Design an enzyme around this catalytic site. Structure first.
Site, PDB file in Angstrom:
ATOM      1  N   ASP A  35       0.820  -1.200   0.000  1.00 46.35           N
ATOM      2  CA  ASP A  35       0.000   0.000   0.000  1.00 46.35           C
ATOM      3  C   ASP A  35       0.859   1.257   0.000  1.00 46.35           C
ATOM      4  OD1 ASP A  35      -1.890   1.948   0.377  1.00 46.35           O
ATOM      5  OD2 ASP A  35      -2.379   1.387   2.455  1.00 46.35           O
ATOM      6  N   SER A 199      -0.625  15.533 -12.189  1.00 44.10           N
ATOM      7  CA  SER A 199      -0.892  15.146 -13.563  1.00 44.10           C
ATOM      8  C   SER A 199      -1.123  16.390 -14.410  1.00 44.10           C
ATOM      9  CB  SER A 199      -2.118  14.236 -13.627  1.00 44.10           C
ATOM     10  OG  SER A 199      -2.488  13.983 -14.970  1.00 44.10           O
TER      11      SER A 199
END
Ligand SMILES: CCN(CC)C(C)=N
Length: 330
Positions: A35, A199
């Site tokens: 994770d 992004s």
């Protein structure tokens, strides 16, 4: 040193991925959920409340000659989905894919919430975010990666998740045969303890690319892709019959639909998520309403590039003095 371990979907939908991990002497092999959105290595154990164990493999520290109780240390964590676990702490030898760390904090669960109990395939979590998020008190502990880093050939790990198929976590090297083209690297902020990056935009299907900054985290421990409501609305508008259902808890769509792809930007590069990756199947057994793999982050406070996005790429988690993230197509 290096390590290399295969990671395998827990079910037919890729709801999560498990990776075998050797703990203790002799080795006790547990299947852990790696994770990159948390920083605790915790396991079902001989100390876990018996009624809260249902099929998981447990760590028994009394059977490990290298286990040592970390005196006074406790831990308690809650995740973005409302699940939680807590307990005490041992140090022991932990190996992943041939890479060995001695003195790793192994957090033994005394209590876990229902969703963990109900998932017989996950024996615990191995956190790979920054150690500043580790919940051990009163002395915070380091992640497996942080402990291994100095020994690694290169201070990196890579995630290569499969679509309805096994994939690979590598430590300490970049497998140049595992991706196509080049890896595009992008800046990381560690201010929130995550692999947080920005992004450069998105496209829906064959549509034009929209240049827009989307700050979010690379999180192998989250199943879906959570993005701003504007972006998510634009995606599902291209699927006839798609709608947001408050009763179901997100966007659903007719199972008869063919889903468009979703592209996200990494610098000047582009990663394309095929439409099929965005299908998470009937909302309930036999239903013709299917659950969407792209959902709104509006109620979360952060955008999350979860497995839906990451499995479309070869992803480099670069733990150099100034960390960065790399993405390649594959
Ligand atoms: C932390 C996410 N998780 C494991 C897939 C659960 C069971 N809640």
């Amino acid at each position: 040193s290096t390590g290399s371990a295969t990671t395998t979907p827990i079910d037919s939908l890729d709801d999560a991925y498990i990776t075998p991990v050797q703990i203790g002497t002799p080795a006790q092999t547990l299947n852990l959920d790696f994770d990159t959105g948390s920083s605790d290595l915790w396991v079902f154990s001989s100390e876990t409340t018996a009624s809260e164990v249902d099929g998981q493999t447990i760590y028994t520290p009394s059977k490990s000659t290298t286990a040592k109780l970390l005196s006074g240390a406790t831990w308690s964590i809650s995740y973005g989905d409302g699940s939680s676990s807590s307990g005490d702490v041992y140090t022991d030898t932990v190996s992943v894919g041939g890479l060995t760390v001695t003195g790793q904090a192994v957090e033994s669960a005394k209590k876990v919430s229902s969703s963990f109990t109900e998932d017989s395939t996950i024996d615990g979590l191995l956190g790979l975010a920054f150690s500043t998020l580790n919940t051990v008190s009163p002395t915070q502990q380091k992640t497996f990666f942080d402990n291994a880093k100095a020994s690694l050939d290169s201070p990196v790990f890579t995630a290569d998740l499969g679509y309805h198929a096994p994939g690979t976590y590598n430590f300490g090297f970049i497998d140049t045969t595992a991706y196509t083209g080049s890896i595009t690297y992008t800046a990381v902020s560690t201010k929130q303890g995550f692999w947080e990056w920005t992004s450069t935009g998105y496209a829906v299907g064959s549509g034009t690319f929209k240049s827009t900054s989307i700050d979010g985290i690379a999180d192998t421990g989250t199943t879906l892709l959570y993005l701003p409501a504007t972006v998510v609305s634009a995606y599902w508008a291209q699927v006839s019959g798609a709608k947001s259902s408050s009763s179901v808890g997100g966007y659903v769509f007719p199972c008869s639909a063919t889903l468009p792809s979703f592209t996200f930007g990494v610098g000047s590069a582009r990663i394309v998520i095929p439409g099929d990756y965005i299908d998470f199947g009937p909302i309930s057994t036999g239903s013709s309403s299917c659950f969407g793999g792209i959902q709104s982050s509006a109620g979360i406070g952060i955008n999350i590039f979860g497995d839906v996005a990451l499995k479309a790429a070869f992803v480099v988690f670069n733990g150099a003095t100034t960390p960065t993230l790399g993405f390649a197509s594959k």
